[PDB]
Design a protein around this ligand. Structure first.
Ligand SMILES: CCCCCCCCCCCCC/C=C/[C@@H](O)[C@H](N)CO
Ligand SMILES: CCCCCCCCCCCCC/C=C/[C@@H](O)[C@H](N)CO
Ligand SMILES: CCCCCCCCCCCCCC(=O)O
Ligand SMILES: CCCCCCCCCCCCCC(=O)O
Lengths: 271, 252, 58, 271, 58, 252
């Protein structure tokens, strides 16, 4: 909830609220009552929707990729090394903070489409997909039927088409006390090698495939991945990203103007 | 006694010899804005006696063919003394009004007017693909008139009385605060209108709020010899007017 | 172990009920009702307070 | 609940209930007992169904539009700028009141159909749609695959065919203290520009699309949108709309007769 | 926090039970049981009451 | 602290970095008219925040030859927003004022102004057998100027500074409420004037009440290079303004 504006009247003092020294690096706590005659207003406005949690807590696509029912070996299955920097939207939000701690709610939207070399009497049974998460170090699949798909330990989801977006919750899996959105440092003590946020990035890889083996007609499926931070804690706010993004692994940017321009410091015409 | 009546606002008094009661808004009497309902934070001006008084608009003549007249508030008062001056200097304002419509005839005369205040009376254009123009909507303190046939105009208000310019049965204007002036019994109508709007205050130039409509449902009639000049005068008084957002004056 | 909270209702004019069904706190719904607020960290990090009605630079 | 009719008998008084003065603008509170000999009747009739809430609280189609699986760029996706004035039915109901405040229950009925250039072995996997709400100001999509469909903040629903009408509840999102059904005013202080109810209308836009990308055969899907007011409050009742509607953005009408006519003031023959 | 109300039963001859499961009051079902009623606003807005058995115009 | 200052009236605030105190009338602070002192019987309007606020008049440039300037109140404010509109619609009115004269220079500049409010400043004509004319007396919000030599004119005010236009030693203007603006120490002067008159209220068009006079007793001076443009601005706020006798508007 917000502040009531308390009624105030005439003044003729030597207390000067309006005059300060911004050099101190301190934001003035002035309110209308200090510089004009105010009436009393009982303010009921709440700041419920600007809470960091409500700000970040909405599912956002972080990526998508495709794989095919049949066609052999790249095509057959797909994989994605988890990271939140390949999309503009979410990435800019998380990036309004330097460090953050949160749980995640993953939701997957999986859709399928038919490809042109059609075939007659094509009548395919429903499709079931499998998504497997391979923590750093785990044996990774090499083709749609590698032994690793038996997932005796890696977690996986098997989902059938037409049945509602599979979903899971994942804890704060970070190894530090928070996820770092920025890292002005290197991976190696000699500073040779990578520099920047990518040095920290090691959250594993997702692997997806069709379970029912390839039928006559070719089918392509796309897996859209959604992230939803939950139970959010965020520290050290920073300016929102100005320059558009260029690369997923660093902050590289093309210089850009501070704002749009207008004709003179006197123009009321809103752009 | 009690058909007689006296109302004093400011330096002005109105007296009536034969009224009905006084119809009051939707039972609500006008009052200044409460701190719990307020949003604009600046201290309001509440001139009082200088602004909440009786302003008498131009008179109009009732003839046996008049379909009706209408005025839009606050517009009708935008030029009346200090009420008008306050409207100019302020971004926001709000007020209630006591409306007193006058019309005396004779005992040998007959006729009956509907006097209604229609809150938010958005009007239709005569030509479907256009919007009426400011002046077809309101001529200020000068009444606009309904017509007894479809109005044509490229930017006029579709004023055929039967739909009261709103696309509804004129005969149902009754769910709005009103009184009748049946010459046989009455001679005036007094209606107190509280401020009705979906916001606590509003700009007084870009929004009209309510429209006064005077519509004869039984035509003026009389035998030859009887006076044929029967004017209808409208006197209105703002009530509990407050303004906020003072700055230079004008529209724009 | 049902928990009854309050719904976002509005201001100028009611409860819910939740039971957690999973063994892990990460499975829980969002903390959409945490309204803590402290601007002082960023708006007034000055060591020597700073009163409003006073001459900022003495 | 309604009033009992209290028994009454003969009279011979100087109290005259039947005679009044309608000039007062006051509706007479007469009941049968005042003008005839009444028997006592214990009335159990309730007015439960005429409560403003039960009157407005039934889902009503407010619009529908279509988009296609394949075919490129207009066709591909659809959009609708939310408003309740393009349908006769609902619009006339809300319009029996000048101001109203209420929550909404949106329900969507989405159906798909095959188009003629058919193709052989056409066997399409189930379709998933996405509906996105773009609050005023949000970056709007320009083609089926614009970045904006990642919805990191705008809310969206992903729904698969064959699974029951997606549904949500939306609060009273108005910026005033109530939704205005009428506005006898202008958007600009100089009165130039728009006039009427449309000046207030700024509730955003809905955007829909197929998620699974275009397959061989063309498919067209229609999205029907339903509104159901809930937790209703309504002020300043007005006469029901007489003249039919002509335009969605204003009250423009063609003059029309007050009722149907009959041969004379004496005809009992109901029309 | 279950709420038990009364069903519409009829008149010349029973309860329900509801639990709200969402954090927002807008998610709640309809207020189909509000029977407030005041015609006076529109049927008798006259400042000087008006008794029925009396001479309307004195 | 205490040379700094902040004054809020209405929606306007004035701040000063280097003042003296605030001189107050004859020790009297302005206040509305008391029932025991009143004679006009009608209920007064006391707009408040809309009329008792700071109006900033035209600026004037101080040059090394300026003899002085003067403005007449209420005249100077007759066109300022609602204060002016209230003056027009009312036969009677009364008010006090907080006068704040501004003038910043540099540390290398020098000069000293007398800022006085002379109640009832009847002025003499340049030619003995005539009366000065309205405009020689007051040019509204535009300052009139004194001269450093006998004014000649057939209907002009005898403006030679040394007699302050009144036939007295300009150096004795001191028994009137005043302050000095000695650039060396000051930069503004603030004077609160209570309503002083031999009647409880008066017409605001036919009577002036008090005249603000700004007269340099030590001339602006500076070395070449220093800015030569040293304006003197005057901001005034009516205080406790009430009006009586509402009617149509104008003079006559
Ligand atoms: C069966 C499916 C299981 C899926 C498991 C996914 C686990 C990955 C959660 C990743 C949360 C990462 C958010 C990003 C953090 C990075 O910004 C920082 N560079 C790390 O400090
Ligand atoms: C994921 C889907 C989200 C869908 C959100 C839809 C939000 C829009 C609700 C609109 C309620 C509008 C009813 C109409 C009000 C208008 O009559 C008035 N002109 C406004 O004052
Ligand atoms: C792990 C599944 C949880 C099962 C929950 C069933 C519903 C609980 C009934 C209400 C009991 C109230 C106190 C306990 O909790
Ligand atoms: C947010 C989901 C709400 C879960 C409701 C499960 C059923 C509640 C069992 C009855 C408990 C009675 C008192 C509480 O409520």
């Amino acid at each position: 909830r917000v502040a009531d504006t308390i009624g105030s009247g005439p003044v003729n003092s030597e207390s000067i609220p309006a005059l300060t020294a911004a050099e101190t690096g301190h934001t003035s706590q002035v309110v209308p009552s200090d510089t004009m005659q105010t009436r009393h207003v009982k303010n009921y406005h709440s700041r419920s929707e600007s809470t960091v949690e409500n700000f970040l807590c909405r599912s956002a696509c972080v990526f998508y990729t495709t794989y095919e029912n049949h066609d052999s070996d790249g095509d057959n299955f797909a994989y994605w090394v988890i990271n939140t920097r390949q999309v503009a939207q979410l990435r800019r939000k998380l990036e309004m903070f330097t460090y953050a701690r949160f749980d995640l709610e993953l939701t997957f939207v999986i859709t399928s489409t038919q490809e042109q070399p059609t075939v007659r009497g094509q009548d395919a049974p429903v499709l079931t997909h499998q998504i497997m998460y391979v923590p750093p170090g785990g044996p990774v699949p090499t083709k749609v039927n590698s032994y690793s798909w038996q997932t005796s330990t890696n977690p996986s989801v098997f989902w059938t088409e037409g049945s509602a977006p599979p979903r899971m919750s994942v804890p704060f899996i970070g190894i530090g006390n928070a996820y770092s959105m920025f890292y002005d440092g290197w991976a190696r003590f000699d500073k040779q090698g990578t520099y920047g946020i990518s040095t920290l990035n090691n959250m594993g890889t997702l692997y997806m495939r069709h379970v029912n083996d390839g039928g006559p007609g070719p089918i392509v499926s796309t897996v859209r991945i959604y992230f939803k931070p939950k139970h959010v804690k965020t520290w050290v706010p920073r300016p929102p990203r100005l320059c558009q993004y260029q690369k997923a692994g660093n902050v590289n940017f093309e210089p850009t103007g501070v704002t749009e321009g207008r004709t003179d410091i006197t123009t009321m015409k809103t752009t | 006694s009690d058909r007689v009546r006296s109302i004093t606002l400011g330096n002005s008094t109105i007296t009536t010899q034969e009224c009905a009661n006084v119809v009051v808004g939707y039972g609500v009497w006008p009052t200044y804005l409460k701190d719990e309902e307020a949003t604009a934070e600046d201290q309001p001006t509440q001139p009082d006696v200088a602004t909440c008084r009786f302003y008498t608009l131009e008179s109009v003549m009732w003839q046996q063919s008049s379909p009706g007249w209408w005025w839009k508030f606050p517009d009708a008062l935008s030029n009346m003394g200090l009420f008008g001056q306050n409207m100019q200097y302020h971004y926001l304002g709000r007020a209630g009004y006591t409306i007193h419509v006058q019309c005396n005839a004779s005992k040998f005369h007959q006729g009956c007017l509907l006097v209604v205040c229609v809150p938010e009376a958005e009007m239709g254009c005569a030509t479907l693909a256009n919007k009426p123009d400011p002046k077809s909507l309101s001529k200020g303190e000068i009444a606009n008139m309904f017509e007894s046939q479809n109005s044509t105009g490229e930017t006029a208000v579709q004023a055929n009385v039967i739909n009261a310019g709103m696309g509804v049965g004129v005969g149902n204007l009754t769910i709005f605060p009103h009184q009748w002036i049946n010459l046989r019994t009455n001679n005036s109508a007094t209606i107190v209108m509280p401020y009705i709007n979906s916001v606590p205050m509003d700009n007084m130039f870009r929004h009209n709020n309510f429209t006064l409509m005077v519509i004869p449902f039984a035509p003026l009639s009389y035998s030859t010899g009887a006076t044929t000049y029967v004017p209808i005068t409208v006197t209105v008084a703002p009530m509990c007017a407050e303004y906020n957002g003072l700055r230079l004056a004008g529209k724009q | 172990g049902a928990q009854v909270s309050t719904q976002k209702t509005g201001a100028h004019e009611i409860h819910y009920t939740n039971i957690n069904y999973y063994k892990d706190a990460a499975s829980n719904s969002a903390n959409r009702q945490d309204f803590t607020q402290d601007p002082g960290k960023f708006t007034e990090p000055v060591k020597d307070i700073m009163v409003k009605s006073m001459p900022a630079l003495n």
